[PDB]
Amino acid sequence: YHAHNKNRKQEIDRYLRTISSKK
Amino acid sequence: ALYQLITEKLDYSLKVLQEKFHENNSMCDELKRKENNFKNRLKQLTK
Secondary structure (H helix, E strand, O other): OHHHHHHHHHHHHHHHHHHHHHO | OHHHHHHHHHHHHHHHHHHHHHHHHHHHHHHHHHHHHHHHHHHHHHO
């Protein structure tokens, strides 16, 4: 659960960075 | 004493971590919908 939580956090960071880039 | 308190700590920590996992999944699929919406907005804009 901790490992996959860190993975999801990293992916969410990437997605937010992409959204800001297009925003 | 080392046993019972630590096992109850871990049993509560299981819920603590599962809550954050479920909320992370919710934030992930909301991010997916958001990026899909922005991409479709771009699609319509170009048209």
